Design a binder for this molecule. Structure first.
Ligand code: ANP
Ligand code: MG
Length: 295
């Protein structure tokens, strides 16, 4: 029925509202991800992600149990998993800071700012989480869906990677590519995936490299600016500017000429290495974290 992975949920009946349909209809939709108040706790807020059972469905439960035991400073812990005949519910803590996607989008609109030290802290957090998943957890965990929407910020402004591990939660490759086009996140899919249809650690490295590039450029891969550029993609445009006469032009003008230019150019080079067309040319998560910390 349901597996409890965190002491924050005292009783299982506290999640009974998840099996009430008309109670779910009233919940706020923050993502599908609902937002509710934990009944057992004294005002703790939880985010409940709803995934559809695959038509395959037996391995996702073992994968969820594996995810429920993973704990890292830069990984979003899974509090509980509720299993219904129609769908699965993954319970996380609600992070009022939001995701990196929301923060960067609001930074574009001028309703928010994000300094370079904070971005470097976020990048180091994502590197630590990716390295723990790739090279430290006893079974190697592949994210398969790394993007700024699956990286949240806690009250320490630390990165926390989410929505990882579930191999069976993913659709087929064609459906994944089409729905990532509609969602505007195809820029994080490595080139090799169009020929291999298989998720590897190097695909997560490519996604991380696109995120690293975003953190300096200040623009998303879905930006129409790249559709009005010669390279027609964020990665190729960045790759050309890094070796151009003036690489500093790739820096977000909000972060420019504030004493962090060389550091941002270094992480741009790191992202360039993380986004090479050949996966064997890309570095592993440990090397990425070491290079990010060498600044
Ligand atoms: N633990 C969480 N805490 C607070 N907000 C969250 C949390 N998880 C998700 N959200 C919000 O829900 C949005 C994304 O939810 P989600 O259903 O995962 O869509 P997605 O990431 O774009 N696609 P995918 O994860 O591949 O299915 C984010 O922008 C968050 O604002
Ligand atoms: Mg998500």
């Amino acid at each position: 029925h349901m597996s409890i992975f965190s002491p924050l949920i005292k009783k299982a009946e506290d999640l009974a509202f998840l099996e009430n349909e008309e109670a779910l209809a009233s919940l706020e939709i923050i993502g599908e991800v609902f937002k509710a108040e934990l009944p057992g706790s004294n005002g703790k807020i939880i985010a409940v992600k709803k995934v559809i059972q695959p038509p395959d469905e037996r391995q996702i439960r073992s994968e969820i149990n594996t995810v429920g035991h993973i704990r890292h400073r830069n990984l979003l812990p899974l509090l509980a998993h509720v299993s219904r005949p129609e769908c699965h519910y993954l319970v996380y803590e609600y992070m009022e800071k939001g995701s990196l996607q929301d923060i960067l989008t609001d930074v574009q609109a001028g309703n928010q700012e994000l300094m370079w030290p904070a971005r470097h802290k976020i990048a180091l957090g994502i590197a630590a989480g990716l390295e723990y998943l790739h090279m430290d957890h006893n079974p190697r965990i592949i994210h398969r869906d790394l993007k700024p929407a699956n990286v949240l910020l806690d009250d320490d402004m630390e990165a926390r990677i989410s929505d990882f591990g579930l191999a069976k939660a993913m659709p087929d490759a064609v459906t994944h590519i089409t729905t990532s086009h509609v969602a505007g996140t195809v820029g994080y899919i490595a080139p090799e995936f169009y020929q291999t249809h298989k998720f590897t650690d190097k695909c997560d490295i490519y996604s991380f490299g696109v995120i690293l590039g975003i953190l300096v450029i200040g623009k998303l891969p879905s930006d129409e600016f790249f559709q009005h550029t010669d390279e027609m993609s964020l990665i190729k445009w960045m790759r050309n500017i890094i070796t151009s006469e003036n690489p500093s032009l790739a820096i977000d003008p909000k972060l420019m000429d504030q004493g962090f230019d060389e550091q941002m150019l270094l992480v741009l080079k790191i992202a360039c290495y993380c986004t090479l067309d050949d996966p064997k040319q890309r570095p592993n998560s440990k090397d990425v974290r070491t290079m990010l910390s060498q600044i």
